[model samples]
Structures are given as structure tokens and as C-alpha cells.
Target: ALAKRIDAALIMKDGRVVKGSNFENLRDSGDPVELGKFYSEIGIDELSFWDITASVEKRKTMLELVEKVAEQIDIPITVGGGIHDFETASELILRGADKVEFNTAAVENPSLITQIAQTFGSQAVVVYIAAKRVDGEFMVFTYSGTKNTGILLRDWVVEVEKRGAGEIVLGSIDRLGTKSGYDTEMIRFVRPLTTLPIIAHRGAGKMEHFLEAFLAGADAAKADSVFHSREIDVRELKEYLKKHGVNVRLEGLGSLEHHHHHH
Candidate 1:
């Protein structure tokens, strides 16, 4: 198994990185390409660029920005939002995105998952689920968390796995941008439903939050507000995890140092 890694999220809207509470009331975080380059230099394990409005706007993702960002970063890039068919997914992969994330389309047409998996391989397709706690049970939300799907979270996860989704990005709508901590209980609840690697996202406030998620069976943790705000250092977090007996990629530190000297 690979070591636990951190995936930095670049939530883009109107061509700029933005942050918000519970996925509302957006605020500027940074420039997409500049932030991508910064995260790459810090040796982040992966980068996720989400075009927050593409699905609702009925347009393609920010491919031009994705191509430019991908050029400067060596890490894997996963682009999401408004990806509803094979053509768009293929274009993204060709434009340097390692994987394409589907949220609204995946929930609306579950077969789309299998189609993409069969055509591009499961690893190239990620099912992004924005989940919220509803009356004490988790429910799936779609269209950038604007519509409730009325589907149980566990049921949706099982369906996606059966349809051949390579991974699941489970984000807590309630905890998003709150910096409280990850929904570790939710992560633990969904971990056994499928064998696919789960990327726990939202509510990551501190180093301990990452540790909690991994201990709860998450393969990776994704954070936006904390990292984008400079509240945490990626390298320091890895060292802290290593000290706590969590397996993380610390070698990235050495590579970063070498790169710094080489430049």
C-alpha cells in the first residue's frame, strides 16, 4: 500500500481560487497557476482543481487554466466540475489532467461511471461526493451541493464501486471550510463499503485532523482552507505524521531542498 498523502484542493470560481464556508459565500484564496506551482514546489502528493461553477453554468471545465497549471507541476492533477461525458474527460486527460472527477453527472447518470471506467480505466475516473448530515443520516448532494439527491451516502458509494469507480472523494458539506476537523466518523462509516481508496476532505483544521482521518481508514486527506491560508506547512505536517507512526512520504522534503538549491 502507498503511504498516506496530502492532496491540496484549488477550488476555482471565475478563474480564481476561492474559499467558502459550507460551500457558500466564496472568497479569494489565490491564483490557480501560482498556487499550483507553490504546492508543487512543496512536494504535495497531488493537486485537485475544481471549477466550482461549471456544472451549474453548463460549460466545460477550465481546461486552459488546467493546461497551464499542469505544465508547471509534476504531481498528478485531478480536474472536476462539468465533466459529463467521455469527450470532456478525454480532453482533460489529454490536456495533462491525470484524472477527472464527476459529481453531478455521476449522480444523475450512474452508468456514466462504468462507461468512463471501461473506456479510460477506473483509475482515471474519480467519483466526487459532497455529503451532508441530514436528520442524523448522511445524504448525497449534487450540482455543487445545491441539490439534495435523496440518496443514502452508503448506498451511493456501493453503487459507484460496483460501477467501477477507482476512488471516492468524500467531502463533508457541513464541515467544508470550517477548519474544525475531518468527518472521521463518516470516513470510518464508508471505508468498509468498498475497497476503493477514499480521499477524506473538508474540515481539516490541524495536523491532528489528518492523523484522525488516516486512523479511521482513509488512504489520503484533502485540505483547502488550512493549506491555502498558510495555516499549515505541508512538509511539517508530513514530519508530524511520521513521528506519530503514520506512514507518509517524507522524501519529498529532500527533493524539495534539492530543487531549491538547484534553482
Candidate 2:
């Protein structure tokens, strides 16, 4: 039921890429080394490594794990977790991360979004938003949905875009772990809020969920347990989408632009 989805890895030092697996942290502490190994085995095109524990405890950045993963992969790497300012973000980026994904700090200060977007370009800045339908209203939550921001999800997306964020990860806290399906309502609600590409997260129980997500309005659809547990494979997803006339990129096999129904 973790909020951080789309786990992938690349060797940091050597730039080798790997696919990532999911980890469950009841105490909020996950072994980055174990996560690194999972990805190292599968392979990934772009590795998005999130510390995922920074908000729980005030620990230092997992540079050693970053180094270990970097040692095995040859692709772009993005690090997130406990990044409070430009300096911390720069530290991870310089260490090996090609990009930085921020959540709590971006919601708390917001200027940090503009600052990083300006200094690193919007493409280098990624903002993650987690939301849930509490009593019929979508509320924004941070810290893995442990903390509420009291801000509406729709407003948060619009504001972050105005702040210059190039991409967004809209995570659904409610749909996480149930294997039920993605919250397309949330995707549809926030789809037109900005031009920034939205990566829908959580509630990807089956292949149809992925298709529904894209059709509803998401630019990209990602699942954790399914990929980690071998229930779904990226290549297979691409193939199925192509076979179903979904226009997904199938290696060199399809003519579609890998387009999703963007709202």
C-alpha cells in the first residue's frame, strides 16, 4: 500500500539500468539496498529512486544506495525524498540523480518549486501529489498520506503547474493495495488542470486498470505490486495496448505515437 509507485533503477556509477520492485515499510524505513537489487535484476529505462523515508525520520540522504544502484545501470536516475531545498536537491542530482521529485516541501513552501524549476528547468523538476476521497471530496495528503494538507486536489495540481512544475505524479491513496482499480475520477478531475504530463499512481490491480487510467485522462500509468510481483510486465503491457489498438509504443512494431488520451 505504499504511495511511491513506478520504481525503476539504473546503475549510478556505470549508468546501467534496471527495473525496480516494491517494498513495504510498516515503520517507514525501507532498505534502499534491497530496492536497488530488485531493479538491478529486472532492468529499467529511466530509474526513479525515492527515499520514501525522509518524512518519517530525519535521516541523511541514501547516497550509498544511490551509488550502489548507479554502479550497475546506464540510464537516467531521479531521486526523491526529504528534499527540502535547492541545496539538498542539488546534492542528490550531483551525486547521480538526473532529476529530483519533491512532495512535502513543494506543498509547504511552493517557492521551492519555482526555484528548482528555474535553476534546473521544469523538465528536471517532478512534483508528486497523493490524494484520497474523504467524504466525497478529494483532499491532498503528503507524507505517504499520513498527513493532510487541507488543500483540494484540483487546486493543488493547478497551483503546482503555475509554479512551473513540468510533470506531476497523481497518487491515489485509497486505491493503493486493494488491487481494485485506479481512481479514474481523480485522473479525470485533475486531467485538464494543466498541460504538465500526469503520471497516475495507485489502484492498478489489473491490465484493464492501466487502460482505463490512460483512457480516462492520464498521460502515463504505473503500478507497483503488479510489476514487483510479476503480475504485469512493461513490455507485455505495451504489446497488449498495441494489440488492442491503444497506440502504445511497441518497440519498433507500431505506428502509434505512444499517445494516451490526454484530457
Candidate 3:
């Protein structure tokens, strides 16, 4: 089996990295650009930056921040938040974002997904699904989890893949910032819905949570607070996964150690 890499999510609000619980009560995490550089040095598989407030405010993502982070990091960067149209999505890619993610806009206009796929190819488009358990089933939420779209999770996921999204980011609002663990059941439910890569987001407290997500069928696992707070060292986590028979890229671990020693 191929190794499953880890992604580091840097959620930004008003241009600063922030962390919150259940998508609310946000507090500062650190400077976005500096953190990007640090994560790059530590050798994360990918870096995701979400504006966190862009869609609700109806403005473009922090392009300047994207450029700054792109300048500092060598890994692929995925940027999202308030990307409502083709132009905004294209501009983000031009501004140095390797992939453009859509949450609110994707649910409101399914056509945008096709348009992005047609224009830049599906590989450039990622659909972010913020899901909450409602009425004993998972429902999709938009606008930073403030607006429940009332769409069934399984159905919407099918629609996104059919419309040409290359990847799906399944975020669990119920697990957001809780650190208890990932919504493995939700991941399991969604895994058979799409053939695209599923990136599990939210509710990662420790190494075991990540392993659980992977075992549940997530192609990649993302975390914010655990990495930001230093509760789990990324290298150690990857090594732990390797020891436990979860194939993870360990090539960078050596470089990370060398870099740390030099510092």
C-alpha cells in the first residue's frame, strides 16, 4: 500500500492564524507566513490555508497572505474561503495557490465546480464539505458552519464528484477543535461516495486519532490545534504511523532532523 501523507491546516481569520472550537470562539495561533515557513522546514506533505471569514464577508481570500506563504514554502498550498466564482479561483492559482478549495460557493452553485474543472482541470479544484450531524444524519454546512445547507452528506458528496471535483475535504463540525478524535464513522460513510481523495479534517488531538482516520479510509488527515500547540510533533507522528504499519513518507524526517540540528 502507498503511504498516506499528513496535511497541516492553517486556519486564518482577518489575516492571522487562528484556532477555534466547533467553528467558533477563534483565537490566535500564530503568524501565517512564519508558520508556513516553519511547517515547510519540518516537511509536512501539504499546507492548507483557509481565510475562515472570506465567504461570510463576501470578499476574496487573502491573496497577499497566499503569496507570502507560497514564497516561503515548497510544499503544495491549498487556499480556500469566499472563492465564489471562476475568476476568484483562477486568481488564487495565479497568486501561487496550487489548489483552490470551495465550501459555501460549491453548495450554492454546483455549476461552479464543473466550470472550475473545465477551466483548470479537476486536479485544481477541491470541494470542502463542512458536515454536522443533524436529525441522526450528517448534513452539510456552509458560510463557516453558520448556515446548514440541509443537503444530505452522501448525496452532496456524490454530486461534487459527478460535477468534477478532484478531491473532497470532509470536515466534522461536531469534532472541530474538540481533539477527541476524527468522525471516523462519517469518513467511513463518505469513503464509498467518491473515488476522489478524501482529506479528513478537524478533531485530531493525538497520533491515534490520525491513525483512526486513515483506517477509516481517509487518504489524508489534516489537523490544526494539535500541530499548532506542539501537542504532537509532525515527524514523531509520522514515525509512529510508520511503526504501526501505516505507510507514511519518512524521507523528509531525516531532513527535518538535520535542519533542526543546524538551527
Top candidate when judged by TM-score against the true structure: 3
* Models ranked on TM-score: 3, 1, 2
RMSD of 1: 4.3
* Candidate 1 segments whose C-alpha is farther than 4 A from its true place: 19-29, 53-61, 255-263
**Candidate 3, 140: how far from true, in Å?**
0.9
Going through the candidates in the order shown, the clash numbers are 1, 20, 0
TM-score of 3: 0.89
Model 2 CA deviation exceeding 4 Å by range? 1-45, 54-61, 252-263
The alpha-carbon deviation from the true structure for residue 49 of candidate 2, after best TM-score superposition, in angstroms, is 1.6
Model 2: weakest 10-residue lDDT segment is 9-18
Q: What is the TM-score of each candidate against the true structure?
A: 0.89, 0.77, 0.89
Error of 2 at 226 (Å): 1.4
Tens-place lDDT per residue, model 3, 144-222, is 8989888999999999999999899999999876988999999999998889999999889889998999999999998
Tens digits of lDDT, candidate 1, 1-263:
35787899887887777753232222323667777767777758999988866454434437787788778888888999778777778788888888889998889899888888887899988999999999989999997788988999999999999999989999999997688889988999999898999999999889999999999999999987787776888888988999999989876555644545564
Candidate 3: Cα lDDT at 142: 93
Clashing pairs in 1: 181-203
